[PDB]
Symmetry: D2
Subunit: 363 residues, 4 copies
């Protein structure tokens, strides 16, 4: 094969620098990129009319939390609407995020679409005019992007077609982003739906990630200028067998070690349906896993960072402080987790220096 450099040394440096800032030690990502339709159910759960104003207010509430979150948040993913909104004082949200040490991200996919001839499987659309959009988003403050592909574990899924097509579209998206100075977060989410066990999820995750990286290679993707947002390896929601956080961690880390090249700058786990606490405990266990991890293992949480805040807010301006306090608490918790220093309840903690090997050959 012959090389026709997709990127210059300067372009590579920029993407790599951005990727590293997002996942710097102790830092993670706040996923606040819900679209109008996606945020609907959540605002409904608190009797709050879904208007641009209330959406702006909620986003402002999260983005303007006190500086304690600064060393916790390396990046914030915004939905198109939000990227162009301003805080009460007139400061554009992108400026607010940056002033606090965070990198601004933008969701660029246009949702999933059904794959004909499959058992309810999908691929994701959004490539049309993506280059122009990325150039504009870059000019308007964004330095990284988000694109979500979705796979499901079932009797005949994910199928060869679903795996191949989703990996290919992720690669196209990644290529377009990098041509525009935008770091692409590659998100091949395997849903936890089903009654399959832990090892089945690990197997599917391994196969999916192997396909993802072959496709990224085929499309000449600069891995150092990318981030990976995968599901943690866990049993299906309806699985009857029970597992410990250490087992989930071992399966998760083993799967990543067998598929993700060291060159990938970081892994920002999606939390799916996990509760705030569960997502923090699992990430902590993941970082405490004895095995060698050559990439940052952090978070890219939506619900896992907003659940309590959304409830505390309830749509009342008077609850601004209370709501922000809940968000700050999860930001702090997860900052400790991505460093393996989180401990669920108490306020004493501070202890983390010892490791030994026992049984990972079972994975």
């Amino acid at each position: 094969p012959h090389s026709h450099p997709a990127l210059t040394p300067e372009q590579k440096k920029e993407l790599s620098d951005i990727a590293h800032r997002i996942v710097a030690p102790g830092k993670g990502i706040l996923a606040a990129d819900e679209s109008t339709g996606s945020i609907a159910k959540r605002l409904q759960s608190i009797g709050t009319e879904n208007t641009e104003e209330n959406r702006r207010f909620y986003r402002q509430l999260l983005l303007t939390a006190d500086d304690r979150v600064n060393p916790c948040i390396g990046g914030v993913i915004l939905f198109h609407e939000t990227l162009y909104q301003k805080a009460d004082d007139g400061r554009p949200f992108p400026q607010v995020i940056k002033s606090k040490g965070g990198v601004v991200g933008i969701k660029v996919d246009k949702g999933v679409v059904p794959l004909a001839g499959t058992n309810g499987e999908t691929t994701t659309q959004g490539l049309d005019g993506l280059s122009e959009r990325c150039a504009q988003y870059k000019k308007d403050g964004a330095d990284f992007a988000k694109w979500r592909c979705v796979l499901k574990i079932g009797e005949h899924t994910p199928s060869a077609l679903a795996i191949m097509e989703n990996a290919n579209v992720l690669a196209r998206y990644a290529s377009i982003c990098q041509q525009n100075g935008i770091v692409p977060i590659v998100e091949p989410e395997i849903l936890p739906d089903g009654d399959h066990d832990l090892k089945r999820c690990q197997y599917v995750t391994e196969k999916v990630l192997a396909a993802v990286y072959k496709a990224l290679s085929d499309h000449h993707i600069y891995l150092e200028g990318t981030l990976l947002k995968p599901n943690m390896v866990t049993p299906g929601h309806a699985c009857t067998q029970k597992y410990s956080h250490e087992e989930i961690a071992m399966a998760t880390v083993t799967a990543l070690r067998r598929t993700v090249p060291p060159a990938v700058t970081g892994v920002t786990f999606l939390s799916g349906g996990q509760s705030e606490e569960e997502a923090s405990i699992n990430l902590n266990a993941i970082n405490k896993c004895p095995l060698l991890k050559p990439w940052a293992l952090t978070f890219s949480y939506g619900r896992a960072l907003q659940a309590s805040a959304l409830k505390a807010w309830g749509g009342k301006k008077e609850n601004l402080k209370a709501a922000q306090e809940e968000y700050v608490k999860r930001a702090l918790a997860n900052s400790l987790a991505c460093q393996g220093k989180y401990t669920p309840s108490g306020q004493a903690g501070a202890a983390a220096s010892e490791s030994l090997f026992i049984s990972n050959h079972a994975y």
Copy 2:
């Protein structure tokens, strides 16, 4: 693998019936789907302002030719704008086309985009919201679609990535079309640009088409409900070595026989940079080639059907009849050519198959 029927017997029948009507014996396709920018230079060559009215008039000129073109035209591809325009008599163009026994086609791709990391290669965009667009186009009179991918023969092209990616996007487009009752014309055009010889074009065409059909298979495409619009196999536009129409026909039919399954309903050749006469002569030779051809071998010409008509018109309303007469001439010529009954002499055949032209093993 497991089957999850992409189409019901009814949907299959609908698609197969449409595909067969388009390429019925003696029928071909008029490709009049040039976009505003694509038709610009065309009108510019005849000193005619590229306005909606002039474009509307030119299309009217072609679509309203006498009933003599009826047995010659099985389908007409239109650009979005034209699908929603009307003739002077108030009839929408789709109705005009249909009353003459032709099937209405609509171009749905959104142009080519550069593939990063390649030597100027491209893929094609246009999948976003394609399903909704197809459902609407169907409702407005269209029964088939057009999507053009472009590949180029060079020192390092077409690359593995270009072949793989273009084949994949064509399959995605085809899949979406069939879900909406639209017959997709799969167009993987290999440009004639360059000084490569006939053997090289045949080689590249064979590898490209093998990739295209494997992709269509992977995406569960119903071949009977599709058509193929490939480049004929010819030497490069600047190849110093010269060839006969019989050699082009042999190279073309051999390439297709080695890659296109018999289930494909028809092959509608693009004319590329060929003149009106050349395109008719090559198509005729292709149909006279002494090899078994399990699919209709006809035309889907743009320039090869409009060149003279455009020039005769010259943008002057009073040249309507003279311009349409020219179009009818090429329509009738190609109608005979797709049956192997064309002779540049005049009407009927006078120059048939000679003899002793063996050694097809040299291809």
Copy 3:
């Protein structure tokens, strides 16, 4: 994307001529290549010692049948041992086959081996030193070869790996054969085991063959110099739903039309566990199928041609004539079947083509 001719025009001509002779109108293949282990149970069914002499005698019985089989047998597949044995008169068996107008074939695979990590799936070995073996076999009278891959329909099979691996090994085998002037018969047999229906077999057959031909393309195989030996498309053996022969034929022909390039010279069906009569009726129906079939559709039968002869022989020399008469009858029946002229009233077919109330779109 560059060509480096694997074969010269002369080599292509030789391979194409050989392939055509084997499947010439009315001719099929006698598969008598059972190894010592495979023929053991065959001999014990008639209480006969599995000695080289009895094997030679049995093969001789079939190869020296009267001249009535000449127009019926275009090729005879032999096991290594047999290729070097002689008839009572001292004539090498390959000479015997050739004098009767048959082409000599040789099995070159070395059996199946388990694919680790699969549910009882296999690939086939035999590539080591295969080029040298082919050159020797060619010198010793053989012009075509046999290589069998086996796939099974089950809950998770054929798997992506199994399909990809078997298709790849068949391509390597075919490439080596063509380099030595040997026509390779590509045999990707999908076993009839299981309770799946006709539709599922057709689906799997379609996916398998699509993979086979993409692999042949990737390995630069000259299709005109090859033959295909696939399973007919039938319901599983344990399938509770019944099907007519016309349905088997429609499913079979449809699958082939959707995957086998017309350049392939011929298709020689394996009969699996079908009875002698069943295999003839099905092949006849296949040739009677009203769809366009661009390749010869004939037989490559083992059991379907030897069952009765083996029984009639019983291992007793005095039964030679009786045994040979049984083989000749099946050779005649299938010769008519591969022309669609078979009837339980052989040598006098005329009245045919009755019904019409059908729907190919149901396939």
Copy 4:
């Protein structure tokens, strides 16, 4: 996809333990598996007769060096013949190797063969009966295997076919080895032949390794139970541009970080045509490269450990100690190099500065 465990937890532990022992810190591999035809050339350079005894003696010379090599050699690769030879004291060589703390390896490939339709490219054979051979080698003292695939950098190479096929066969070989308790060393060597520069070699190496690992994933290979033996990334042997050891180290480590999953236990570099000193210095730089390296980076040298020894021996039984001395010196140097603690000076005469490069004798 579905999991059908290729290995039990016990089998994985055995393979993992073996792999780790071979590349334990400070340890490397002595590749003394030259076939008789290959070693005959080196014995020829010293006017020594290529007899079984001479070969036995030479191998004994290397395998029985003093205990100073013990901490340096984690593994020794042998050719079939040597595996069944004994030292002067009657001890089988495998026992000799084990008593010194080394793991015994066996070459199992049967050499390269030409890929038809390519520009002098090859694949490698040796799969036939490999399972039975591994089981026997395991019983006879071997715990790991060696299989070499060869690729060349040129205008059209390595081709898509060559990359795909070589990656696939390496995967089949690895699969069979693991089923028999043998650790497979995956060796996809990209020859240094040519005038290409460093970045071109890096590009090709990245593409080749990406293909190798995708194939290993497709074939369900347990990476923790494998080792990788790739070429270091260097400019072509005929490249005009000069590079430093730091640059070679940077390109090599970067290519590996972009393709080799952290789960791979170790990388044992081949030296190609590098001199004994050149190979040690580059390995040292590789280990000193400032990038994160999640796998052991050591050696698997043949001539790079035998050059001086072979020259000092000269086929004279009295030069035993002299020869061994040269070998121990190189073993020590590389032992320090794989820990990034090597620094040269005077030692290792001109025989260690001579290029051990020999153009690929084929095309």
